[PDB]
């Protein structure tokens, strides 16, 4: 069942798989992050409160002086949104903070204070976020793009390469905290264990073991397994554990209890082990040569003499065995080393350990951390015990603690933010386990180890960065001087916080200009995931492995949309349904699968849970009960895709198209193209300029509605009801009764955005779509914006295409275009530019904006008023005066013979110089709006007075009008109320509205609601008065500007760039092209009915680029326009309602087994006619992306029209008038227009300006500069015999500062001579080398 | 330099010299005072850190500027790709230049390029000034400047005069080899885009999807004579890498010629007798006979068997109508058998090469232009579309897939019973899917290339087909037999990022469309290919730079 | 190798244009060398006629005038 806004153009659909989930609100990531960042949070989980409670209170260094936190509040913005765009300042808000300074009493450290103070402190301004996730910073609209970064937590990464030519593998565990220092461990090619801190010089990892207050005995106790020997008064016998003999060949016959278990020479078999276990063998005598291979464990000193027999980590020799034997050391501790299980890496590292105690280790790490300086006891001890144990300099994270405890297999998910001893213990144990073999490596590209941080978290970090600086400053100031009784403001400082947050939002690597040339462009630029920026990598140091797709991208990141060229795989976009977890991992939905029944409940699944489960496929047919109708399903369990059974399914995919982005989901027949052309299509879709009259998609996906509504361009009704008055500027809604709050008077007023500019100069503009007195509902569109059409995204226009080669004019990729396209004015786009003219303050004096300029007649001065600024609505062209500005000139130092000429004529040169702003060459348009700013002290001129008067009258009129309509609605509601309980039907309109709000009634809530409406009226008039005063003061007050400037005039142009050979037009499947010619109507190929085809593409582009999707799109478009043509001809003569009913129903029932039963028995002869009228240009068709519309459905849809099933119809020829044999494909393809306009590219330079230090021309076309004659061009010219051309290519035309003037005189004198000279930049090189002691000189 | 609005821009050397002079002055003042030796030794070390001025950032660490960035010393003004050598002394920015988008414009002769009138008006400004002053149409040069500013109607004839025999230079950004820069005469265009002749897009490696080229102007007499003698387009028709021509007709014209020279087995008017190629032209355009029908014609071929003298020979060859139409293009000295076949792409390249090696250069360049003209004409007259019925799926495909599935099921059961090894089952599966893919490709090609069945005056006959994709592939006009079977047969076995091969290949074609899993498998290969084609460019450029600096 | 034999060149501007400039300049400076501008990189840098293409006759004339 469809709303009234959907009974206008109800789109025909083809999707087979019934979706069970609504597409979520497409910006919720950006909005929800910044909602977390700034919100009154009555606990320190996330937000500003988290930073404050993590950095406050502040204590002076036992000075009994406490500064502590209370709360914070966000102020009202001084300038709202459109004022911030007009003026140019950040849409910010003050951050008023309540802080408390308290000083404790003497010998009362925990005792009460002797003084308090509570002052509301202002600490900078944070920018705010508009209701589309965009910030306004300096007049512009900037977006901060979310970052993808390596997670805080442990990583048991291997090396896994050759990397030495040893053919070995190195397992280098690594710990990364969210704020702190790294702690790397790695093995060497000689398999010894090392350590390094913050990528410094290597150290053997025993140093930190000792520095954790551990001696050698406990180290060998923790990191090895003891082997105990018992001197049984002889033979040095050893006890047994039967597992210890696995995979070994004992040199003797293992025998006990008079029973042979293992033979000599025989290995200890598995059944030997089982027999040893069953027979309960404890202790045997061993040959004495077995113990000689051991390494002793602990310190067995001489108990008599107090001397050492053997320390820890000593290999034993038989004489030393006798020495411990004669000392009576019956119990001897050793180690269970091995070649397979228990590697002696700690033992050998202790052998290469050059330390002996804690102090040696701390001295060593102090030297390694900082060279040069002498070691010190307290400095080294404080450095080490502060580095990895401070809440200050080491915050692991909450998410870091979670992931660390998970990857360590420890149960508890929450713990400290600093590293304890047990954490390093278990990290060492697991690294040793991995080197032994029990354990598995991790990887980087797996999306379970990469988070998503958005504007909330980055803003919070920048705020903390400001706060630590201000806290250090306070701790400085609180220490010195006095107690004082001073007020808690002068030790605090606004600028070292606002500076930090403004340097983040103003120029980071993430805050960029929002491409604002399409609703799709804004949407796909707000949901962008970037791997660059701070905390990440750079494109010059990014290996191919992070650029690649990964099996954990299925439904969390789009694999097919990515910018190509310099950075592929770094700026991956986000999927359609892909949410974000609580911690910040990416999450995607799945439908719960019971025993065999698909339950339509939804469970969100993270990146690491998706492996242990089994996930079904969305293309699995099921029959009305959730049972899979097959006996198998193509699931995916751990990377692979294996044909599992009906019973082993745990989760089913949600919708068929959750693998793509939003930008790539608007491509019909995506499942046919090669991924290269799909990438190029989805990247060219976000560059289409909005045309003059946005038409439709004839063959669209079906998800244009959500993109149009969820982007901020269209104006969506907030409460349903009747529309009361529709201008082209405003829309007034009267709300329904049930949706009306009891408090206020309910009408709505929307104010549309008529003809303003965008960051790419295109003309963002809205127009209404509803009419007067027509019901709407909650959520309909009321005003289409740029590229929208009745709430559906329409990025271009759809035109009749034919695939045939045509006389070379579409040779490689060119696109022949008929004159009907330009004649119907259907690819015409509107641009809007901004021109600024400052009036600076020179030392010779101030410039003026007077109308009077020298040396110009009346042709230029016809279009300036008396003040000297161009009129509103003046058809200016290139090179014409807009802002007449003169500048003072000192003397000019007049010269010979023109001195004599001045003596002849006497027309003295003025002391002023013309420097007025004129229109840049090549453009032409109408001036739509003039903006004038001025410094406060300067007296304003006439035109500024006109503008201020007009703005003030407009503001007063609009505010008065808003109050008028609001009171009209309020009194109408009062009139409706007063009928109930004491009706004044004719009595009410007798008296005026003066005392209607005070009349008595039955003493109900409406009696004490007439007073509510009366107080609403009084509040409305008072609010009107105060807001009018505020607005008047805001208009009339001066505008703060840059230092040393007087006034700025901003003039707005509106070009109407039509279409020309050179423009780039693209399809949707990434078939680009440049228009080569614009033929007349008659020359175009026309089919048998006389209708000329409109665009003649090239067929050779299909079977080599393989994007076969565009041909099926062409066929389906031909079917759609066929049905539209049939219904148009049916509506041409007035036939009947029921005839249209019959045909429309039949057209809406194709083909077999689709959803969307859309029967027309519930439409009532007005909607039917409106539907038919809105359909007559062609019935729109939907195609969900991977669900698709199969070929036979297209065949039968074409057969519904009279068009041939083959899709190809014979085209005659325009010129000869004869017939093309081999009939050719025609049909309706949706074709875009990218904003690579030719006139923005084409530029030339005869002799422009020249660069200052090196006499070369300037950059590209902004300063009228020449081309870059690269090194390879010089190689090419050397390859030919061309010598003189090269000589003039790098001497006369560029750098020989006398040669070029001589060349100009020679050229205009009609004598193409040249005079070489020597290049200027070479002479600069001579001076640079000679600036050193390098005497270099030319000589002959 | 004084920036506007009271801002000052300076180089960092002012700061460095300030530092050195300051420390030197301080040391002078200390030596006046007879300071302690620790103070003067510290000051001399500071004066040593001269080192920053000469080459900052070599010894120790680099002192930084107010923006906390390592500032630039003299050695950074010399060295690097931003120093004088690579960036300012070898490659300069040039006056008299411009750039724009490019378009095709097949009406051009190949020694001339199209050029917009406005770019001509800007580039040739001083020539126009001189010509106007010489003709006495402006008294001074100032009046001439204001006259060309007003674009008054007599300036265009002056532009036409000074544009007459004046070459320009055209160049695209990756100038790999010496054909990257060529000369052209201009023909003025009432547009805004450079029209560039279609035959040299192969040499420029240029396609018209928005690519831009830069123009340069030779000024002096020696430079224009160089541009006409060496760099002119009609003097570079052979590649310097090898003697093969570089004016091969590329994709559309070769398709037109391939369609023009074939033979339907029974078309309108077969077996008549024609009395010369002019009769073939008349019989075609009147429509009484088809373009391709086997017709006994009479033709005369001239051979230069004598000492550089042509000798006529005329006979009754047995050819088609389209070939006899094409024969009016070939010049005198070529034997007739050069146009008596299907005329693919290697064939036409060899035809051009033979014409060059036998006749000379001028007839070969005129022959090249006539070939492009007639190729475009009959390609457009073909009407060679591409439709969804032009991708035939061989009907044995699903049976082959079913049999291969049976084989892989048997090997799966064998490894389930442990009779075989994991690498064994891997290679068994990979070989049976390879065999099935090969067999389905054989089935598709044998159903596509030859299935056309027409009947000459009798029962039945089979011929090569006109199934437009088969023409676009067999003719050589931008279509490979390995990029079919991704439109009809299975798409082979894609590879995982590790470099291995997936056990279950993608068995779906772009006509039937892939499902979600197959598409997600196919995505990785495209992304890896894109990244490699992006990162091969830097290595190739570096290799070229090394080679041209060693030789 | 080409990157090695492309640095043992008699000309030193042709060496300093393509490599780290510091080592080349210092070795040339202690050597007191004297480039003669014989190749192509030198004559491109100083911006006179290439001794290869059209300028070969001019350079042959200059050499003929030189030392004669
Ligand atoms: C308690 C809350 C969820 C409940 C479990 C935990 C789980 C993960 C925690 C966030 C992450 O650590 C990342 C980030 C680190 C910053 O330093 C402080 C802010 C952030 C957003 C943390 C706030 C909060 O602590 C989070 C949301
Ligand atoms: C009769 C109707 C109420 C019905 C009960 C009242 C209430 C809203 C009123 C319009 C609004 O004010 C907007 C607009 C302002 C213009 O400036 C003057 C005209 C407009 C159209 C007004 C005319 C009329 O007064 C309206 C329709
Ligand atoms: Mg290109």
Curated annotation (Swiss-Prot), chain A:
Any one GO molecular function term: ribonucleoside binding
Taxonomic superkingdom: Bacteria
The protein's Enzyme Commission number: 2.7.7.6
Catalysed reaction, written as an equation: RNA(n) + a ribonucleoside 5'-triphosphate = RNA(n+1) + diphosphate
Gene3D superfamilies cross-referenced by the UniProt entry: 2.40.50.100, 2.40.50.150, 3.90.1100.10, 6.10.140.1670, DNA-directed RNA polymerase, beta subunit, external 1 domain, DNA-directed RNA polymerase, subunit 2, domain 6, RNA polymerase alpha subunit dimerisation domain, RNA polymerase Rpb2, domain 2
Transcription in keyword set: yes
N6-acetyllysine PTM positions: 1021, 1199
Keywords on record: Acetylation, DNA-directed RNA polymerase, Nucleotidyltransferase, Transcription, Transferase
GO cellular component terms attached to this protein's record: DNA-directed RNA polymerase complex
Enzyme class name: transferase
Alphabetical GO biological process terms: DNA-templated transcription
PROSITE patterns per record: RNA_POL_BETA (PS01166)
The keyword Cell cycle appears for this protein: no
Family named by the database record: Belongs to the RNA polymerase beta chain family.
Purpose of the protein: DNA-dependent RNA polymerase catalyzes the transcription of DNA into RNA using the four ribonucleoside triphosphates as substrates.
NCBIfam families membership: PRK00405.1 (NF001616), rpoB (TIGR02013)
Subunit structure and binding partners: The RNAP catalytic core consists of 2 alpha, 1 beta, 1 beta' and 1 omega subunit. When a sigma factor is associated with the core the holoenzyme is formed, which can initiate transcription.
Stated name of the protein: DNA-directed RNA polymerase subunit beta
Gene responsible for this protein: rpoB
């Amino acid at each position: 069942v469809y709303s009234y806004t959907e009974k206008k153009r109800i789109r025909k659909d083809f999707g087979k798989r019934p979706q069970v989930l609504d597409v979520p609100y497409l910006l919720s990531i950006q909005l929800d992050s910044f909602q977390k960042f700034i919100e009154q949070d009555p606990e320190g989980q996330y937000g500003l409160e988290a930073a404050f409670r993590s950095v406050f209170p502040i204590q002076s260094y036992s000075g009994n002086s406490e500064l502590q936190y209370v709360s914070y509040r966000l102020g009202e913005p001084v300038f709202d949104v459109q004022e911030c765009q007009i003026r140019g300042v950040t849409y910010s808000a003050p951050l008023r903070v309540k802080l408390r300074l308290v000083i404790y009493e003497r010998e009362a450290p925990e005792g009460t204070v002797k003084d308090i103070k509570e002052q509301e402190v202002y600490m900078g301004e944070i920018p705010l976020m508009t209701d589309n996730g965009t910030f306004v910073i300096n007049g512009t609209e900037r977006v901060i793009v979310s970052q993808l970064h390596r997670s805080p937590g442990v990583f048991f990464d291997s090396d896994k390469g050759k990397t030495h030519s040893s053919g070995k593998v190195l397992y280098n565990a690594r710990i990364i905290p969210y704020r702190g220092s790294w702690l790397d461990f790695e093995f060497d090619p000689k398999d010894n264990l090392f350590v390094r801190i913050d990528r410094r010089r290597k150290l053997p990892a025993t140093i930190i073991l000792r520095a954790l207050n551990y001696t050698t005995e406990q180290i060998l106790d923790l990191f090895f397994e003891k082997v105990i020997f018992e001197i049984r008064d002889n033979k040095l016998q050893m006890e047994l554990v039967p597992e210890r003999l696995r995979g070994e060949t004992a040199s003797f016959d293992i025998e006990a209890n008079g029973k042979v278990y293992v033979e000599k020479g025989r290995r200890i078999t598995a059944r030997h082990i089982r027999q040893l276990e069953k027979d309960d063998v404890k202790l045997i005598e061993v040959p004495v040569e077995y113990i000689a291979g051991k390494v002793v464990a602990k310190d067995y000193i001489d108990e008599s003499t107090g001397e050492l027999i053997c320390a820890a980590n000593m290999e034993l020799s038989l004489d030393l065995l006798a020495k411990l034997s004669q000392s009576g050391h019956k119990r001897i501790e050793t180690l269970f080393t091995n070649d397979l299980d228990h590697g002696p890496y700690i033992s050998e590292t202790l052998r290469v350990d050059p330390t002996n105690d804690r102090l040696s280790a701390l001295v060593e790490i102090y030297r390694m951390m900082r060279p040069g300086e002498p070691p010190t006891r307290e400095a080294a001890e404080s450095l080490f015990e502060n580095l990895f144990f401070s809440e200050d300099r080491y915050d692991l994270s909450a998410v870091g603690r979670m992931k660390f405890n998970r990857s360590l297999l420890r149960e508890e998910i929450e713990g400290s933010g600093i590293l304890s001893k047990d954490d390093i213990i278990d990290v060492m144990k697991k690294l040793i386990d991995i080197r032994n073999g029990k354990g598995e490596v991790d990887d980087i590209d797996h999306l379970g180890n990469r988070r998503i941080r958005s504007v909330g978290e980055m803003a919070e970090n920048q705020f903390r960065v400001g706060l630590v600086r201000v806290e250090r400053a306070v701790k400085e100031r609180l220490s010195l001087g006095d107690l004082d009784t001073l007020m808690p403001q002068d030790m605090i400082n606004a600028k070292p916080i606002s500076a930090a947050v403004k340097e983040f939002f103003g120029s980071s690597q993430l805050s960029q200009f929002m491409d604002q040339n399409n609703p799709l462009s804004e949407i796909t630029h707000k949901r962008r995931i970037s791997a660059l920026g701070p905390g990440g990598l750079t494109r010059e140091r990014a290996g191919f492995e992070v650029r690649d797709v990964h099996p954990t991208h299925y439904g969390r990141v789009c694999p097919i949309e990515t910018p190509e060229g310099p950075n592929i795989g770094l700026i991956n976009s986000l999927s359609v349904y892909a949410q974000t977890n609580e911690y910040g991992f990416l999450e995607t939905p799945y439908r719960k699968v019971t025993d065999g029944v698909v339950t339509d409940e939804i469970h969100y699944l993270s990146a690491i849970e998706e492996g242990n489960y089994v996930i079904a496929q969305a293309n699995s047919n099921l029959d009305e009960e959730g049972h899979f109708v097959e006996d198998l399903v193509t699931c995916r369990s751990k990377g692979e895709s294996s044909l599992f059974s009906r019973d082993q399914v745990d989760y089913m995919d949600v919708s068929t198209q959750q693998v793509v982005s939003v930008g790539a989901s608007l491509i019909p027949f995506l499942e046919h193209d090669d991924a290269n052309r799909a990438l190029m299509g989805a990247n060219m879709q976000r560059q289409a300029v909005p045309t003059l009259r946005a038409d439709k998609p004839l063959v669209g996906t079906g998800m244009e509605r959500a993109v149009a509504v969820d982007s901020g361009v269209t104006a969506v009704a907030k409460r349903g009801g009747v529309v009361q008055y529709v201008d082209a500027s405003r829309i007034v809604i009267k709300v329904n009764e049930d949706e009306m709050y009891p408090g206020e008077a309910g009408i709505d007023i929307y104010n549309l955005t008529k003809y303003t500019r965008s960051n790419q100069n295109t003309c963002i503009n809205q127009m209404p779509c509803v009419s007067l007195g027509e019901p709407v509902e909650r959520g309909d569109v009321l005003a289409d914006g740029p590229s929208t059409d009745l709430g559906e995204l329409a990025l271009g226009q759809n035109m009749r295409v034919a695939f045939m080669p045509w006389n070379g004019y579409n040779f490689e990729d060119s696109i022949l275009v008929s004159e009907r396209v330009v004649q119907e004015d259907r690819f015409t786009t509107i641009h809007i530019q901004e021109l600024a003219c400052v009036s600076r303050d020179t030392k010779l004096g101030p410039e003026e904006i007077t109308a009077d300029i020298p040396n110009v007649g009346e042709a230029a001065l016809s279009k300036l008023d008396e003040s000297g600024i161009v009129y509103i609505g003046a058809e200016v062209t290139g090179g014409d005066i807009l802002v007449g500005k003169v500048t003072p000139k000192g003397e000019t130092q007049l010269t010979p013979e023109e001195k004599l000429l001045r003596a002849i004529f006497g027309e003295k040169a003025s002391d002023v110089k013309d420097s007025s702003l004129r229109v840049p060459n090549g453009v032409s348009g109408t001036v739509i709006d003039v903006q004038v700013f001025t410094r406060d002290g300067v007296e304003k001129d006439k035109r500024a007075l006109e503008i201020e008067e007009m703005q003030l009258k407009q503001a007063k009129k609009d505010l008065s009008e808003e109050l008028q309509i609001l009171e009209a609605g309020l009194f109408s509601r009062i009139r409706a109320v007063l009928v109930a309980g004491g009706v004044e039907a004719e009595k009410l309109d007798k008296l005026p509205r003066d005392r209607w709000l005070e009349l008595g009634l039955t003493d109900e809530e409406k009696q004490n609601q007439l007073e509510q409406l009366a107080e609403q009226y009084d509040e409305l008039k008072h609010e009107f008065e105060k807001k009018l005063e505020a607005k008047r003061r805001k208009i009339t007050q001066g505008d703060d500007l840059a230092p040393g400037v007087l006034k700025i005039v901003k003039v707005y142009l509106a070009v109407k760039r039509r279409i020309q050979p050179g423009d780039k037009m693209a399809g949707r499947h990434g078939n680009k092209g440049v228009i080569s010619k614009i033929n007349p109507i008659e020359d175009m190929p026309y089919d048998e009915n006389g209708t000329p085809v409109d665009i003649v593409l090239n067929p050779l582009g299909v079977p080599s680029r393989m994007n076969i999707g565009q041909i099926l799109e062409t066929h389906l478009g031909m079917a759609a326009k066929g049905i539209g043509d049939k219904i148009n001809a049916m509506l041409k003569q007035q036939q009947e309602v029921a005839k249209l009913r019959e045909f429309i129903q039949r057209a809406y029932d194709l083909g077999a087994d689709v959803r969307q039963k859309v029967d027309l028995s519930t439409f009532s002869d007005e909607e039917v006619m409106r539907l038919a009228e809105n359909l007559r240009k062609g019935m729109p068709i939907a195609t969900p992306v991977f669900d698709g519309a199969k070929e036979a459905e297209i065949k039968e849809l074409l057969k519904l029209g009279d068009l041939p099933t083959s899709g190809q119809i014979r085209l005659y020829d325009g010129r000869t008038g004869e017939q093309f044999e081999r009939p050719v494909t025609v049909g309706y393809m949706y074709m875009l227009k990218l904003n690579h306009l030719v006139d923005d590219k084409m530029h030339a330079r005869s002799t422009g300006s020249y660069s200052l230090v090196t006499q070369q021309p300037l950059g590209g076309k902004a300063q009228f500069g020449g081309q870059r004659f690269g090194e390879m061009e010089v190689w090419a010219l050397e390859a030919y015999g061309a010598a003189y051309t090269l000589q003039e290519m790098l001497t006369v035309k560029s750098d020989d500062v006398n040669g070029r003037t001589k060349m100009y005189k020679n050229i205009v004198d009609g004598n193409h001579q040249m005079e070489p000279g020597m290049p200027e930049s070479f002479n600069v090189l001579l001076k640079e080398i000679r600036s050193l002691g390098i005497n270099i000189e030319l000589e002959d | 330099v004084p920036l506007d609005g009271g801002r000052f821009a300076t180089s960092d050397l002012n700061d460095l010299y300030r530092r050195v002079i300051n420390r030197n002055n301080r040391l002078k003042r200390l030596l006046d005072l007879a300071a302690p030796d620790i103070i003067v030794r510290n000051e001399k070390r500071m004066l040593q850190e001269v080192d920053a001025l000469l080459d900052n950032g070599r010894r120790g660490r680099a002192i930084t500027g107010s923006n906390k960035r390592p500032l630039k010393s003299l050695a950074d003004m010399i060295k690097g790709k931003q120093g004088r050598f690579r960036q300012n002394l070898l490659g300069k920015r040039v006056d008299y230049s411009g750039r724009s988008v490019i378009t095709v414009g097949p009406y051009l002769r190949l020694h001339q390029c199209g050029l917009p009138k406005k770019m001509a008006l800007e580039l040739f400004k001083p020539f126009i000034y001189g010509k106007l002053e010489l003709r006495g149409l402006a008294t001074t040069i100032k009046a001439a400047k204001k006259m060309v500013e007003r674009e008054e109607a007599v300036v265009w004839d002056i532009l036409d005069e000074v544009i007459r025999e004046h070459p320009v230079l055209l160049n695209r950004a990756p100038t790999l080899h010496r054909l990257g820069i060529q000369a052209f005469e201009p023909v003025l265009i009432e547009g805004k885009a450079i029209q560039l002749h279609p035959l040299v897009c192969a040499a420029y490696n240029a396609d018209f999807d928005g690519d831009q080229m830069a123009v340069h102007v030779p000024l002096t007499l020696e430079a224009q004579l160089e541009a006409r003698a060496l760099m002119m387009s009609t003097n570079n028709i052979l590649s310097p890498a090898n003697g093969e021509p570089i004016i091969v007709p590329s994709q559309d014209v070769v398709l037109g010629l391939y369609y023009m020279t074939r033979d339907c087995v029974n078309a309108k008017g077969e077996g008549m007798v024609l009395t010369g190629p002019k009769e073939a032209e008349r019989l075609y355009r009147s429509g009484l006979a088809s373009l391709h029908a086997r017709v006994k014609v009479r033709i005369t071929e001239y051979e230069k068997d004598a000492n550089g003298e042509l000798v006529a020979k005329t006979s009754l060859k047995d050819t088609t109508v389209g070939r006899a139409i094409l024969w009016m293009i070939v010049p005198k000295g070529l034997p007739y058998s050069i146009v008596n076949q299907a005329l693919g792409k290697k064939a036409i390249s060899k035809m051009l090469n033979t014409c060059y090696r036998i006749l000379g250069l001028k007839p070969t360049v005129i022959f090249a232009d006539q070939i492009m003209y007639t190729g475009f004409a009959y390609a457009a007259r073909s009407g060679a579309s591409v439709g969804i019925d032009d991708m035939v799926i061989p009907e044995k495909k699903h049976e082959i897939i079913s049999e291969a599935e049976a084989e892989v099921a048997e090997i799966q059961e064998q490894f389930q019973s442990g009779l075989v090894t994991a690498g064994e089952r891997y290679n068994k599966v990979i070989d049976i899917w390879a065999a099935a893919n090969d067999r389905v490709s054989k089935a598709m090609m044998d159903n596509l290339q030859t299935e056309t069945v027409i009947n000459r005056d009798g029962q039945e006959e089979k011929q090569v087909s006109f199934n437009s994709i088969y023409m676009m592939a067999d003719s050589g006009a931008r279509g490979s037999a390995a990029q079919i079977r991704q439109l009809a047969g299975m798409r082979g076995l894609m590879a995982k990022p590790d470099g291995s091969i997936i056990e279950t290949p993608i068995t779906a074609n772009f006509r039937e469309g892939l499902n979600v899993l197959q598409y997600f498998i196919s995505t990785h290969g495209a992304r890896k290919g894109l990244a490699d084609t992006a990162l091969k460019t830097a290595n190739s450029g570096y290799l070229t730079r090394r080679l041209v600096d060693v030789a | 190798g080409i990157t090695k034999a492309s640095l043992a060149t008699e000309s030193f501007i042709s060496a300093a244009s393509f490599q780290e400039t510091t080592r080349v300049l210092t070795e040339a400076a202690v050597a007191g060398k004297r480039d003669e501008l014989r190749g192509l990189k030198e004559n491109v840098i100083v911006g006179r006629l290439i001794p290869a293409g059209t300028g070969y006759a001019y350079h042959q004339d200059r050499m003929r005038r030189r030392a004669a």
